[PDB]
Amino acid sequence: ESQYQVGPLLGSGGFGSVYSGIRVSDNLPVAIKHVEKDRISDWGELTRVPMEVVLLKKVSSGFSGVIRLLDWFERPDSFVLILERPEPVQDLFDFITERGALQEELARSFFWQVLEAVRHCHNCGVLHRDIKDENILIDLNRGELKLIDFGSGALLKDTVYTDFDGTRVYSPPEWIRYHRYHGRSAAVWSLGILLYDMVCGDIPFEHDEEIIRGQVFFRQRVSSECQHLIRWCLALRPSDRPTFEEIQNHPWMQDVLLPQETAEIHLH
Ligand SMILES: NC(=O)c1ccc2cccc(O)c2n1
């Protein structure tokens, strides 16, 4: 390829291999993601493409809480996706690994931005299905979070999902026990795991039994309101979980900092 200059490997795993790149035409920072054709369980179309590209095109549209797909290419054995790349950036998993449990004010700003990103995906007919710290990029200058890696997502629908291939420890008890979930309520459970992770510095449950028991213990000092929001997101019955609107109207969620204030105060 002559359109992009390839830089260091940023990571690899279930999502494929992602390299740092630069778009040669205007020096835009990009991430260049290679997905092997035979590791794609899930195809859509517009000629057959990974669901991931279908879902990205449906959400890649002005609102910047979701990484944008700038271009894609097909190769004999893979697809290559050209994605936005903020710079400097750190994913939330590394950030929490380095900084430990986040102060509530900072978790509140981050969590709120996740919720706007996920509402956007949903408004666009897309369910992420793998919301977790490793799939959230922090633009450290602007304090803006971006959801990445739609490679386990699906078109949003209102009937039951019986397949899943996101991250188990973020998956709800109905998936664990029955291999069934509805998209919104599973997304909210993963948001409870995510919010506990932000405020405690690690995820609450490691084991199937703990997921199914849904008993939440706090190892860090966490406000009653935050604990209540988390415990609500993690209701065992899917229909007892809050909607996005109820999450965002929760008292813990009030007075969120703007992303810019967030970076000035907490990211320097
Ligand atoms: N949607 C994507 O998987 C994606 C998009 C952009 C990325 C930027 C930096 C590091 C990454 O792992 C990235 N992954």
Curated annotation (Swiss-Prot):
Keyword annotations of the record: Apoptosis, ATP-binding, Cell cycle, Cell membrane, Cytoplasm, Host-virus interaction, Kinase, Magnesium, Membrane, Metal-binding, Nucleotide-binding, Nucleus, Phosphoprotein, Proto-oncogene, Serine/threonine-protein kinase, Transferase, Ubl conjugation
Effect noted on mutating H34Y: Increased kinase activity
Tissue expr: Expressed primarily in cells of the hematopoietic and germline lineages. Isoform 1 and isoform 2 are both expressed in prostate cancer cell lines.
Chemical reaction(s) catalysed: L-seryl-[protein] + ATP = O-phospho-L-seryl-[protein] + ADP + H(+); L-threonyl-[protein] + ATP = O-phospho-L-threonyl-[protein] + ADP + H(+)
Family indicated by similarity: Belongs to the protein kinase superfamily. CAMK Ser/Thr protein kinase family. PIM subfamily.
Any Pfam family the entry gives: Pkinase
Organism for this UniProt entry: Homo sapiens
EC number(s) on file: 2.7.11.1
Protein name, UniProt field: Serine/threonine-protein kinase pim-1
Subunit field text: Interacts with RP9. Interacts with HSP90AA1, this interaction stabilizes PIM1 protein levels. Interacts (ubiquitinated form) with HSP70 and promotes its proteasomal degradation. (Microbial infection) Interacts with Epstein-Barr virus EBNA6; this interaction upregulates and stabilizes PIM1 and induces cell proliferation by inhibiting the growth suppressive properties of p21.
Phosphoserine found at: S61, S224
